[PDB]
User: Fold this.
Amino acid sequence: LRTILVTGGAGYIGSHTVLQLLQQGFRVVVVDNLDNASEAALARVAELAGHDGANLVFHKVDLRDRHALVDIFSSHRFEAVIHFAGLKAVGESVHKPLLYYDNNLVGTITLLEVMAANGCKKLVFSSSATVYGWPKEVPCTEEFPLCATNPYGRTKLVIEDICRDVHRSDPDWKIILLRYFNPVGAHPSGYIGEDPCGVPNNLMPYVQQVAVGRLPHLTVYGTDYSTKDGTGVRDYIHVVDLADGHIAALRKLYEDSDKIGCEVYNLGTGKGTSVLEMVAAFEKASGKKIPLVFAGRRPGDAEIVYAATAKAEKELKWKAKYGIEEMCRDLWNWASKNPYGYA
Amino acid sequence: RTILVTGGAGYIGSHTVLQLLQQGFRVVVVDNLDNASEAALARVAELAGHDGANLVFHKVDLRDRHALVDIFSSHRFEAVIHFAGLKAVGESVHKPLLYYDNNLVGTITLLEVMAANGCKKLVFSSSATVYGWPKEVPCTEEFPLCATNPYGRTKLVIEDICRDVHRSDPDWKIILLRYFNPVGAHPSGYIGENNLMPYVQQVAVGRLPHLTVYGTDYSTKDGTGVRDYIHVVDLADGHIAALRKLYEDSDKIGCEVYNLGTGKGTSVLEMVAAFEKASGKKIPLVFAGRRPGDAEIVYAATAKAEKELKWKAKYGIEEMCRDLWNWASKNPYGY
Ligand SMILES: NC(=O)c1ccc[n+]([C@@H]2O[C@H](COP(=O)([O-])OP(=O)(O)OC[C@H]3O[C@@H](n4cnc5c(N)ncnc54)[C@H](O)[C@@H]3O)[C@@H](O)[C@H]2O)c1
Ligand SMILES: CC(=O)N[C@H]1[C@@H](OP(=O)(O)OP(=O)(O)OC[C@H]2O[C@@H](n3ccc(=O)[nH]c3=O)[C@H](O)[C@@H]2O)O[C@H](CO)[C@@H](O)[C@@H]1O
Ligand SMILES: CC(=O)N[C@H]1[C@@H](OP(=O)(O)OP(=O)(O)OC[C@H]2O[C@@H](n3ccc(=O)[nH]c3=O)[C@H](O)[C@@H]2O)O[C@H](CO)[C@@H](O)[C@@H]1O
Assistant:
């Protein structure tokens, strides 16, 4: 038996990773306070897991709840921990920074302490390409200068530094930091997917709601950038590909862990795609038309960001297999099948 | 006028509490006593003279939200001076989570309790360590910031937290004070304290045989490291000025950062010579290579602090060594 602890597994990226984990034969324990997710996402993952659905156990616990967390760790043998949990809305983080510093930092510090006290010192952390700030060049390698422009991005960069300091003090720690780029899409079944609250802030969940008629038009944030068509360019990666990156991270920690301490890997496709190109791909995949409103640049937006995949391909032995066309297909499938989410 | 002082039983905190007690403030100190004795605040109450009755102490950890909420509901604080936290750099590298927990989680809880109680006026004890190895000197508040150890990272992260908090809530008035190198003690010799001058003192009395000079080939005038050493009583006065600035000229304050230094740079050998004159003892030396992570030369740009904060250091190197020797001679085994 191989058991994995997954914080925030009820959420968007976590649920898709939990499903892949169950299909690989892992036992999965999820810890999630359901603050930005519902039980339904986990129940449907259990259903998609077929026979392996019973290998998923859900604990409705906050990572800051130290006693509830010790109970879980002292009553389990965890091979590793995948740490998805945290708040992630950039706008909300600027307006309520203490909420973000509290939930993300105190939750992570508590988790790391409970892990070290219960002999589990293998960790995979959800970092983000936001730590590259506004990069001076592309593609972004893992050695690019790091910075943060908002409280949310600050919590990611600080947790990274905490993980590096922790390994520096204790060589028994094996930590892989995964800098996600822009995940889009859903499981190709259309049964699970991203279910954002309120008005979505990311591009593709917004275009999604325009396509099903819930919102009237997409607002394009700035057209005067130095890109092909003036819109921002991003590295869009299929969420299923992001999930498989975590499987490859566990395989790295399980088979070739003597040569790692606290490592960082990009999880991207290496291809840059503009806003209009994504809208064009979603119109082709869905047959719907996305009305456009043109506005100025969004404060804090980068111009062009995509990943240098060489390091992940070499050390993790991992490369994304889904392209833009499949991402929009699977997003539309989840969208048309579940236009109002899990509710 | 009541002021909450976290970490007020410590080195810099006790001296600030004494200066506050002499200025006529009621002072409530919160300190878990994990790195300080209660005898320090007992002696401070003595030196406060007729004002000793204004000091109130609570042995409370900042992470204890329930206890911390009760103290804030018991008084109406004008502002909070935040000294509390761990500061041993070597203890930050070997035990980083202990530092990230105590400093960050303690500070987060305090800022939240402050906001809920309505006391959004903060003076935070930062450090010139955030200037890393400066490319030029003197170091202004605009210099690029970076941390080189877990302790320094907690200092820089707390500064950014205060930056973000004020940005989200204009009712907040925050002053960040970057200390430099504290030296000395209250001139009475009654209170005081990993650093050069405490190491020099142990060599003077004989607890240690010699002082290792870490690096002799620096691009300085005598080849040894240069720092901005500031009297701890001057540091205490800098916080009185920070409260004066918050209480008077406050409408143009958001999250202001002020250096607290003398503006003068003194080498290692110059401090050894200064302490030998004030103590009469001799300091045998052993010259060694550069210590890893050590800045070459660092000292403060004091122009911003002299104008807007209306503060300037009063004490020089000679008096620092005199008060340090005075306190350590009369109390060789501490409190
Ligand atoms: N979503 C993205 O586009 C993206 C890209 C880069 C990085 N990331 C990071 O990847 C991770 C996963 O993102 P996501 O899209 O799945 O987000 P999500 O909000 O869908 O999932 C995060 C989950 O964590 C849970 N959670 C939050 N605080 C918790 C706490 N204190 N204790 C327990 N559970 C808690 C939430 O309830 C939620 O279910 C996050 O850490 C995010 O910051 C996100
Ligand atoms: C500043 C900011 O919020 N950055 C976050 C976001 O931005 P990031 O810009 O990377 O991603 P978004 O999905 O928010 O935006 C993608 C692109 O589409 C454009 N766009 C987006 C939404 C919309 O309604 N209209 C529109 O035109 C943007 O200008 C951008 O060029 O990416 C990640 C989310 O997964 C986070 O790690 C980043 O912190
Ligand atoms: C690694 C470390 O501890 N950093 C702390 C230290 O740095 P900082 O170097 O500024 O102060 P130190 O007391 O450690 O020594 C200052 C100077 O004396 C020299 N020296 C010191 C001791 C010795 O035994 N021999 C010798 O030659 C140093 O090289 C340096 O040039 O003082 C500050 C006190 O406020 C703290 O903020 C810093 O976090």
In short: The first helix of chain B runs from residue 11 to 22. Residues B 89, 127, 129, 181-182, 195-196, 199, 211-214, 225, 227, 268, 291, 293-294 surround uridine-diphosphate-N-acetylglucosamine (ligand 3) (CB under 6 Å). The radius of gyration of chain B is 19 Å. The interface with chain A takes residues 92-97, 100-101, 104-105, 108, 111-112, 115, 150, 153, 157, 160-161, 164-165, 167-168 of chain B (CB under 8 Å).
